[PDB]
Design a protein around this ligand. Structure first.
Ligand SMILES: [Mg+2]
Ligand SMILES: [Mg+2]
Ligand SMILES: [Mg+2]
Ligand SMILES: [Mg+2]
Ligand SMILES: [Mg+2]
Ligand SMILES: [Mg+2]
Ligand SMILES: [Mg+2]
Ligand SMILES: [Mg+2]
Ligand SMILES: [Mg+2]
Ligand SMILES: [Mg+2]
Ligand SMILES: [Mg+2]
Ligand SMILES: [Mg+2]
Ligand SMILES: [Mg+2]
Ligand SMILES: [Mg+2]
Ligand SMILES: [Mg+2]
Ligand SMILES: [Mg+2]
Ligand SMILES: [Mg+2]
Ligand SMILES: [Mg+2]
Ligand SMILES: [Mg+2]
Ligand SMILES: [Mg+2]
Ligand SMILES: [Mg+2]
Ligand SMILES: [Mg+2]
Ligand SMILES: [Mg+2]
Ligand SMILES: [Mg+2]
Ligand SMILES: [Mg+2]
Ligand SMILES: [Mg+2]
Ligand SMILES: [Mg+2]
Ligand SMILES: [Mg+2]
Ligand SMILES: [Mg+2]
Ligand SMILES: [Mg+2]
Ligand SMILES: [Mg+2]
Ligand SMILES: [Mg+2]
Ligand SMILES: [Mg+2]
Ligand SMILES: [Mg+2]
Ligand SMILES: [Mg+2]
Ligand SMILES: [Mg+2]
Ligand SMILES: [Mg+2]
Ligand SMILES: [Mg+2]
Ligand SMILES: [Mg+2]
Ligand SMILES: [Mg+2]
Ligand SMILES: [Mg+2]
Ligand SMILES: [Mg+2]
Ligand SMILES: [Mg+2]
Ligand SMILES: [Mg+2]
Ligand SMILES: [Mg+2]
Ligand SMILES: [Mg+2]
Ligand SMILES: [Mg+2]
Ligand SMILES: [Mg+2]
Ligand SMILES: [Mg+2]
Ligand SMILES: [Mg+2]
Ligand SMILES: [Mg+2]
Ligand SMILES: [Mg+2]
Ligand SMILES: [Mg+2]
Ligand SMILES: [Mg+2]
Ligand SMILES: [Mg+2]
Ligand SMILES: [Mg+2]
Ligand SMILES: [Mg+2]
Ligand SMILES: [Mg+2]
Ligand SMILES: [Mg+2]
Ligand SMILES: [Mg+2]
Ligand SMILES: [Mg+2]
Lengths: 148, 183, 124, 141, 52
RNA sequence: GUCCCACCCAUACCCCGCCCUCAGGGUAGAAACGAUGCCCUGAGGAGUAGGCGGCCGUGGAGGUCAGUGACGAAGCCUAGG
RNA sequence: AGACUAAUCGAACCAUCUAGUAGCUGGUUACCGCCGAAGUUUCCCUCAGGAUAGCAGUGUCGACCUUCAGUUUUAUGAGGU
RNA sequence: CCGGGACCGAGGACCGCGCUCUGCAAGGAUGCUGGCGUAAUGGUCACCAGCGACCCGUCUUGAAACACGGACCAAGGAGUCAAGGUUUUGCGCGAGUGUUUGGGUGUAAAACCCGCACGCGUAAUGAAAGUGAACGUAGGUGAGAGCUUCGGCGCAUCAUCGA
RNA sequence: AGAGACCGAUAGCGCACAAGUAGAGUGAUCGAAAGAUGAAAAGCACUUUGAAAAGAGGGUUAAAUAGCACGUGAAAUUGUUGAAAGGGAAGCGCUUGUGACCAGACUUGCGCCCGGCGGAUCAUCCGGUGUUCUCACCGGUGCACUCCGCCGGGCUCAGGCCA
């Protein structure tokens, strides 16, 4: 919508808000990233510290599928089971049955452990598991088993 | 001549909501009457918070409510002039009654499942016109992505604008003594 | 009928604020325009030149928009519109639009006389 | 509920089909509107209780709104015609609006509107002929 | 010819508005204020007994 | 050259009227209100480059005034209001 | 003789690439209201130009926080005109 | 304590402070009287008179300039559009969010409906192999709006010492 | 072939017309201007002045203030008639005066008392209907010191302009 913009309010005022002494010429200072090392250095060092240089070794023909392993913390583990069944376990009505969670079927490969876990035994099947996550699931009565 | 430093100086705070919601306009009318003819300071604070924009009314969560429901506050009424959000980490939800601007679908269900009650800012004025036995809450104002970029500079430990992250994007000169200097 | 009693009307100015240098060139209308010249003598408020319109020339809020009789003009288009002035005959006056036919013009005047509403342009 | 008299005023505050807005003032061409002004107090079509007066062939005709049948518009108006005497019509209208708490704030306007309608049904006197001041010399020839 | 002619709006907001409009269709004062002539209709949610 | 009386006038100072801007108050067991309204009180107004707000006109599109018109629409002329 | 080669020669004429690039001249369209500058610091094959800090406007939030100040007073230090 | 003159009359039931207290000069003008009811008061336009008044636009420390453009009139004539960023305003849903590449359907370039994948977000850090977030009621101390059984509990955010 | 929040004769393709035409260049090539009488030509017979072009009468038409220089016909520039000013520029600002021309407003309204004319129907009660459930409408009953309209006479209050 052009009916309300600052160009309509500039009618009748010479120079259209760009100044008299500085007249808004074509391209003062250069085009694009010109002057990175010569006259735009002061801007390119106060912000963007690190534009120039080489760091690290290079990799030819990287395939990102080799590096796919999404992770999930341990405090969100109970959120995988459906709500109706979930409330039964926390309320304490089963007392004799344990759930078996399959992380791969939900799209996870590594089980990290960050929060706390209630004292109910579970079984977790993961491709990878952290050292701290294995201890917390074990002290709750459960066990974690690798599945590949 | 009068030799003054300031003249015709305006106010610095909002005096009316910029939103055009019809129902919100009614809610401002109610509390504008209450604040004028009541001595309780609780009414004046609620009125101003109705004017604020969305970034000045950050959401609060169920977990943050349960944090402040201890040390003798289990019987008070929680008032939040913002949205209220369910937390997936909290397994057991305590019993409480909450007066909020709006609730998410899951937050409303889990509050009443435990035996609670969900109120509304208009019903709150009908039950507690003076705000007795209430506690106000806010969300984390600075917990926003855009705030991390504020005040960038050397030796400030802020976040830069980069189109991607990796070893090829910045780092290098000015980030390690192996290439020139460091910041 | 006569209008309500009101305070006396003061205009504060009658001239029309003509445009600078419009009396020497035929390509410029007389409608006022703010001069933006860097060294214009009118913009700098030199002594002995045309004045410039300011908010200090405004009229009283009580007597604003009312003609010297005491009424306020109201543009009408048919006989149904003039009946909106049934309850306002001491504050408002009717005015027939320029595109109304001659036959409908006398219908409005006849109806307006019953209600006592003054008509600004009726002698035709 | 989600609908009330206050809400309808909020939706129709700025523009509605009955609005007549121009310079020097704004008006409303509403049947249930006394004084034909645009205001919450005088907006008949939004309030639950409203009054309206329409001239009949001989006298005034007054219609009121029945709050019990809001959703049924064909039978939502209580109408009555007064054609007996000016003073008798004045008393009935005032009692109809200020005896049982049915818009007692409209008592003064209802009587005044009825007074104007009856005044407009009298025979009109003939206006005196116009005179001439500067064209008198012209017309002498 | 490659200026932006069409626009994209959320399906959630589309459903909110079409539900809001239906609610306003059962309010007789709003019907009159939009210019309709409903002074002689029995009920404002008019329903016909499947004669059509 | 020095000293002493009276008098003359700036858009400056004092008192009064009116306009706008800014700030602080009053108004629902509503006989009520363009609540964006109305009522009461005080102070202030120079400005290029530049910033923001409010409003007026032109060509088209949706809705609405059950709008004006061959008994004369649009356009044009007019020291007539 | 840098002479002549269709009134054109220290490199002819016609169409296209082509709306060739310009730190340099010229222009940049209605009204009212409120606030209101800079020619100085550091770096650049930089000196008719840019980036950086300052001066300026707008949007706000925290309290109405009793905090503040181009000022005087009292006690006590520094200086080499 | 008594004279003389000029300019002004804002407000519109009662309420107040007071006094010389059957009343009043005390929170803002009323009383009596005359001529005329039309060109008389008032308004527009042309001309004479007293005083004031250098040609506009532009670059510039400085323009009425012996600085540049402009003989006159009518129509045309200059911050736009797309992709990608960023902060701020309004709106929907909210640990999630996005129907429209595509399919179903239709009064047919409109409207309405459906889901598998995928994008951004939910976890960081190293060049890399790799590893991967609770001693405590998710901590201690000083300020903090609001609430309070008056003892105290203390959101947002700021500073500081730790995990 | 079907369509548009596109342009409307200096616009839209260079071309709405005998336009890639007229015209320019030895040549490759360059390349315009120009739409509209009326519903229907009914496109002015006949007479008279003139060498002729044409004029004056008289005709057609709703209109010739539409006559093949044709719908509407603006500005720069020009002619005639009317009004006014001028001793080496003119224009313009503030404030009176003279002359010309002109818009408003006022020309009655309300109330009381006496007299006269004309009408059905004021308080009250009964039946029916509606409604805000105590306030009204309709039918009947009134029947002249009541109620309503008009005319004539008398009186109070207010109402235009300058002092
Ligand atoms: Mg400017
Ligand atoms: Mg310029
Ligand atoms: Mg610049
Ligand atoms: Mg260099
Ligand atoms: Mg001043
Ligand atoms: Mg090296
Ligand atoms: Mg004026
Ligand atoms: Mg200057
Ligand atoms: Mg002055
Ligand atoms: Mg002042
Ligand atoms: Mg256009
Ligand atoms: Mg016309
Ligand atoms: Mg030589
Ligand atoms: Mg040649
Ligand atoms: Mg030659
Ligand atoms: Mg060559
Ligand atoms: Mg060439
Ligand atoms: Mg260009
Ligand atoms: Mg070029
Ligand atoms: Mg100013
Ligand atoms: Mg200033
Ligand atoms: Mg220069
Ligand atoms: Mg500032
Ligand atoms: Mg020395
Ligand atoms: Mg020295
Ligand atoms: Mg005053
Ligand atoms: Mg005169
Ligand atoms: Mg002079
Ligand atoms: Mg120079
Ligand atoms: Mg300068
Ligand atoms: Mg100049
Ligand atoms: Mg010179
Ligand atoms: Mg120069
Ligand atoms: Mg030059
Ligand atoms: Mg020249
Ligand atoms: Mg020119
Ligand atoms: Mg000339
Ligand atoms: Mg033009
Ligand atoms: Mg973009
Ligand atoms: Mg997803
Ligand atoms: Mg990694
Ligand atoms: Mg406190
Ligand atoms: Mg045209
Ligand atoms: Mg063309
Ligand atoms: Mg042409
Ligand atoms: Mg054109
Ligand atoms: Mg062409
Ligand atoms: Mg040829
Ligand atoms: Mg033509
Ligand atoms: Mg002839
Ligand atoms: Mg002959
Ligand atoms: Mg004609
Ligand atoms: Mg003829
Ligand atoms: Mg014609
Ligand atoms: Mg011609
Ligand atoms: Mg013509
Ligand atoms: Mg002319
Ligand atoms: Mg001479
Ligand atoms: Mg002169
Ligand atoms: Mg004069
Ligand atoms: Mg009866």
């Amino acid at each position: 919508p052009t009916r309300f913009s600052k160009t309509r309010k500039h009618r009748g005022h010479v120079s259209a808000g760009k100044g008299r002494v500085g007249k808004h010429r074509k391209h003062p200072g250069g085009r694009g990233m010109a002057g990175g090392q010569h006259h735009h250095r002061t801007n390119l060092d106060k912000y963007h510290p690190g534009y120039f240089g080489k760091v690290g070794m290079r990799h030819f023909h990287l395939l990102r599928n080799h590096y796919w392993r999404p992770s999930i913390n341990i405090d969100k583990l109970w959120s995988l089971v459906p709500s109706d069944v979930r409330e039964q376990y926390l309320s304490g009505q089963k007392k004799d049955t344990a759930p078996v969670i399959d992380l791969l079927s939900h799209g996870y490969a590594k089980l990290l452990g960050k929060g706390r876990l209630p004292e109910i035994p579970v079984v977790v099947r993961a491709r990878y598991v952290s050292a701290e996550a294995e201890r917390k699931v074990k002290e709750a009565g459960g066990v974690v088993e690798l599945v590949a | 001549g009068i030799d003054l430093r300031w003249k015709h100086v305006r106010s610095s705070h909002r005096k009316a909501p910029k939103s055009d919601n019809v129902y919100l306009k009614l809610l401002v009318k109610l509390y504008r009457f209450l604040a004028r003819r009541t001595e309780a300071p609780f009414n004046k604070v609620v009125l101003r918070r109705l004017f604020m924009s969305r970034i000045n009314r950050p959401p609060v969560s169920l977990s943050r409510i349960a944090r402040n429901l201890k040390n003798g506050n289990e019987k008070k009424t929680v008032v939040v002039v913002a949205t209220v959000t369910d937390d997936n980490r909290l397994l057991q939800v305590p019993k409480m009654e909450v007066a909020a601007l709006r609730f998410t679908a899951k937050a409303r269900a889990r509050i009443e499942a435990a035996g609670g009650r969900t109120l509304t800012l208009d019903q709150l004025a009908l039950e507690k016109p003076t705000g007795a036995n209430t506690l106000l809450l806010r969300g984390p104002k600075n917990a926003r992505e855009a705030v991390k970029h504020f005040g960038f500079g050397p030796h400030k430990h802020k976040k830069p604008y980069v189109r991607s992250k990796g070893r090829k994007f910045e780092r290098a000169r000015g980030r390690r003594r192996s290439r020139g200097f460091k910041v | 009928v006569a209008a309500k009693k009101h305070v006396p009307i003061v205009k504060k100015r009658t001239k029309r604020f003509m445009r600078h240098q419009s009396d020497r060139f035929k390509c410029l209308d007389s409608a006022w325009r703010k001069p933006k010249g860097i060294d214009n003598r009118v913009r700098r408020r030199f002594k002995g030149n045309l004045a410039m319109p300011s908010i200090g020339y405004g009229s009283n809020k009580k007597t604003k928009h009312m003609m010297p009789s005491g009424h306020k003009a109201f543009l009408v288009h048919n006989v149904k519109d003039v009946e909106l002035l049934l309850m306002h005959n001491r504050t408002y006056a009717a005015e027939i639009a320029h595109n109304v036919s001659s036959r409908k013009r006398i219908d409005i005047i006849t109806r307006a006389k019953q209600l006592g509403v003054k008509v600004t342009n009726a002698k035709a | 509920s989600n609908v009330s008299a206050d809400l309808i005023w909020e939706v129709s505050r700025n523009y509605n089909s009955f609005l007549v807005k121009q310079r020097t003032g704004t008006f409303s061409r509403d049947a249930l509107n006394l004084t034909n002004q645009h205001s919450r107090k005088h907006a008949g079509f939004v309030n639950d209780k409203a009054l309206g007066i329409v001239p009949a062939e001989k006298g005034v005709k007054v219609i009121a709104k029945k709050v019990k049948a809001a959703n049924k518009p064909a039978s939502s108006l209580y109408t009555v015609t007064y054609k007996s005497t000016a003073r008798k019509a004045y008393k009935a209208i005032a009692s109809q609006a200020a005896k049982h708490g049915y818009r007692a704030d409209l008592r003064q306007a209802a009587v005044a509107r009825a007074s104007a309608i009856l005044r407009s049904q009298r025979p009109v006197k003939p206006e005196p002929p116009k005179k001439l001041r500067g064209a008198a010399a012209r017309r002498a020839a | 010819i490659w200026r932006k002619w069409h626009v994209k709006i959320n399906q959630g907001q589309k459903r909110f508005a079409t539900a809001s409009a239906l609610a306003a269709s059962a309010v007789a004062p709003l019907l009159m204020a939009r210019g309709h002539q409903v002074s002689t209709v029995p009920e404002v949610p008019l329903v016909v007994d499947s004669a059509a």
